[PDB]
Symmetry: C3
Subunit: 120 residues, 3 copies
């Protein structure tokens, strides 16, 4: 899987980025068994002020996680994984859970390529 993590520039220090990536990676392995080396966390930084909520410009605290998964997991597992990411990213980033959004999209494994190989 690939987790696109949308954050404001400099909101996360290198060690906070590492903590967040580890927290997402460990969530994605503890619950599903997805091996460590399969989890990509890709931080997309933008200047603070580029996020609007209800048309109101935000500071730099919002985090949006868009997880891109292969189809086939149960709704229970996906809901548990999403909640685990909220909780563990909240801790690793020192950010209130209310600032964290997490969406999971899914695709057939047959149209997903990782490390230049098709997914099982």
């Amino acid at each position: 899987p690939v987790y696109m993590v949308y954050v404001s520039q400099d909101r996360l220090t290198p060690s906070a980025k590492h903590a967040v990536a580890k927290a997402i990676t460990d969530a994605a392995r503890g619950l599903t068994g997805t091996q460590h080396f399969l989890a990509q966390v890709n931080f997309q930084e933008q200047p603070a002020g580029n996020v609007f909520l209800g048309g109101v410009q935000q500071g730099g605290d919002t985090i949006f996680v868009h997880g891109l998964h292969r189809e086939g997991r149960s709704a229970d597992l996906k809901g548990q994984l999403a909640q685990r990411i909220v909780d563990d990213v909240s801790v690793a980033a020192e950010i209130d859970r209310k600032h964290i959004w997490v969406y999971f999209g899914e695709m057939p494994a047959q149209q997903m390529v990782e490390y230049g190989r098709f997914l099982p």
Copy 2:
């Protein structure tokens, strides 16, 4: 919902970003009744020249809106909402509608978390 808005750096001034975010937020609530605070507009700026169309490098005028939605709306409502975003973003950014692309993706509410809470 989350609207990822892919624009060139400095193509939108702070007031143009606010107008675009308002136009997208107002389209969404005016057609589905999603509360204001539920609409995130997330601007992703890149240097001009990073967009290619048919392999031809573009200037800074392209706008691509990727809307990430809960499943369950009718094809008619989604089409109306996409068309409204084209029109109102065209006005708010004073940019030809031919430069505006809008795709909607959908996911089960059960794998979507906003403000650290699951969606209905």
Copy 3:
């Protein structure tokens, strides 16, 4: 279609970006018939160090291609296109295939607008 191409800043020279964009555009048309002008390649650059794999911070070599397509192609064509993108991006960027990830998402044409008009 829109291909979002996530790369590290300055990993691709302007001529390498053009080559990658051409390679993706040519894959898309040569396999499906998608007309030249219909293919948008949108490069999203981030500082090297913003990609983590298995929690390990990466250099600037990863490439992730997120293709956004209209529904309706066969699984065979989609897999052929993804494999073709891996191969031709590998050459055009002179980058090991093992650094290239390619995911395809699909949506109904009825909720996709290109050049300010709805898709067939």
